[PDB]
Design an enzyme around this catalytic site. Structure first.
Site, PDB file in Angstrom:
ATOM      1  N   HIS A  91       0.838  -1.176   0.000  1.00  0.00           N
ATOM      2  CA  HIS A  91       0.000   0.000   0.000  1.00  0.00           C
ATOM      3  C   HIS A  91       0.880   1.236   0.000  1.00  0.00           C
ATOM      4  O   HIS A  91       2.123   1.159   0.108  1.00  0.00           O
ATOM      5  CB  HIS A  91      -0.923   0.056   1.216  1.00  0.00           C
ATOM      6  N   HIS A  93       1.128   5.653   1.205  1.00  0.00           N
ATOM      7  CA  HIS A  93       0.695   6.827   1.964  1.00  0.00           C
ATOM      8  C   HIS A  93       1.016   8.021   1.098  1.00  0.00           C
ATOM      9  O   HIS A  93       2.066   8.073   0.457  1.00  0.00           O
ATOM     10  CB  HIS A  93       1.455   6.947   3.304  1.00  0.00           C
ATOM     11  N   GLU A 103       5.872   9.006   5.152  1.00  0.00           N
ATOM     12  CA  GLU A 103       5.894   8.779   6.580  1.00  0.00           C
ATOM     13  C   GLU A 103       7.314   8.980   7.103  1.00  0.00           C
ATOM     14  O   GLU A 103       7.559   9.846   7.948  1.00  0.00           O
ATOM     15  CB  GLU A 103       5.345   7.380   6.863  1.00  0.00           C
ATOM     16  N   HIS A 116       4.788   0.895   0.971  1.00  0.00           N
ATOM     17  CA  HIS A 116       5.115  -0.123   1.956  1.00  0.00           C
ATOM     18  C   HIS A 116       4.787  -1.509   1.462  1.00  0.00           C
ATOM     19  O   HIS A 116       3.623  -1.801   1.188  1.00  0.00           O
ATOM     20  CB  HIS A 116       4.380   0.127   3.280  1.00  0.00           C
ATOM     21  N   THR A 195       2.677   1.597  11.257  1.00  0.00           N
ATOM     22  CA  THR A 195       2.460   3.042  11.319  1.00  0.00           C
ATOM     23  C   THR A 195       0.986   3.375  11.394  1.00  0.00           C
ATOM     24  O   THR A 195       0.618   4.545  11.437  1.00  0.00           O
ATOM     25  CB  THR A 195       3.064   3.801  10.137  1.00  0.00           C
TER      26      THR A 195
HETATM   27 ZN   LIG Z   1       2.104   1.856   5.486  1.00  0.00          ZN
END
Ligand SMILES: [Zn+2]
EC number: 4.2.1.1
Length: 257
Positions: A91, A93, A103, A116, A195
């Site tokens: 996925h 962010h 992140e 990630h 996270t």
């Molecule tokens: Zn993630």
């Protein structure tokens, strides 16, 4: 419930998940000058030739591309890792604007997004058991900047119309995640956490130094996704990143130079 809004965002998570203020939380700022080269680290082994994607899901906080992890196909090993870790999902962010979204940060620099690739340690048998262990997961983090399109990403971009809202999924087979990797596998590594809630401290983080480039049009389509479910008021899925957390008693190691 938790999210990334004004009233349920990262600053609130500790109330339901007290480990949010724990000793090995992620993400962190990577201070490139203080990370120490560790010549004992091994080259990363990323073996994705037999990866079998199955599905893509809008889970209300991101979209996950899920893999069949019922056999040893797509595996991560080597680098800082002992043993074999199986790919379960990836996925991203991302931001509302190109100047934020990642992140992890690199000398406080925020990238437009962060990928990630999540893997679990096969010695614990399944993902649920793995997240209960300090070495249960290995997550490969890859930074994205906006520039040239990533051809290998377009198949992901194009299915997003079918999973606009929370809880929607779509068949997504034969996607090859090797198309998301940069040229170099140089990395930083440190011990950390998920996270997102439950924020479990079960991750060996492996963050690649070399970002990949995606086009403005590519990330624009991500920003059209919804946090909400169908028939609910529209909240665009943007700024689904947790900010950097205190490093505390940890060292970030570099695989290079
Ligand atoms: Zn993630």
């Amino acid at each position: 419930h938790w999210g990334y809004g004004k009233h349920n965002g990262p600053e609130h998570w500790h109330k339901d998940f007290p480990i949010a203020k724990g000793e090995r939380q992620s993400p962190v700022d990577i201070d490139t000058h203080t990370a120490k080269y560790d010549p004992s680290l091994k080259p990363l082994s990323v073996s994705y030739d037999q990866a079998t994607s199955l599905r893509i899901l809008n889970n209300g906080h991101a979209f996950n591309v899920e893999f069949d992890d019922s056999q040893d196909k797509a595996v991560l090993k080597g680098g800082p890792l002992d043993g074999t870790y199986r790919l379960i999902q990836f996925h991203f962010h991302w931001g509302s604007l190109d100047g934020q979204g990642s992140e992890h940060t690199v000398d406080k620099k925020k990238y437009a997004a962060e990928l990630h690739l999540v893997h679990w340690n096969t010695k614990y048998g399944d993902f649920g058991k793995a997240v209960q262990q300090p070495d249960g997961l290995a997550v490969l983090g890859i930074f994205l900047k906006v520039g040239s399109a990533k051809p290998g990403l377009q198949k992901v971009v194009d299915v997003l119309d079918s999973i606009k809202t929370k809880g929607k999924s779509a068949d997504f087979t034969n996607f090859d995640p090797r198309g998301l990797l940069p040229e170099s596998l140089d990395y930083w590594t440190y011990p950390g956490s998920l996270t997102t809630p439950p924020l479990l401290e079960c991750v060996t983080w492996i963050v690649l130094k070399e970002p990949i480039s995606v086009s403005s049009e590519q990330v624009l389509k991500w920003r059209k996704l919804n946090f909400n479910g169908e028939g609910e008021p529209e909240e665009l899925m943007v700024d689904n990143w947790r900010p950097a957390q205190p490093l505390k008693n940890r060292e970030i190691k570099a695989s290079f130079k």
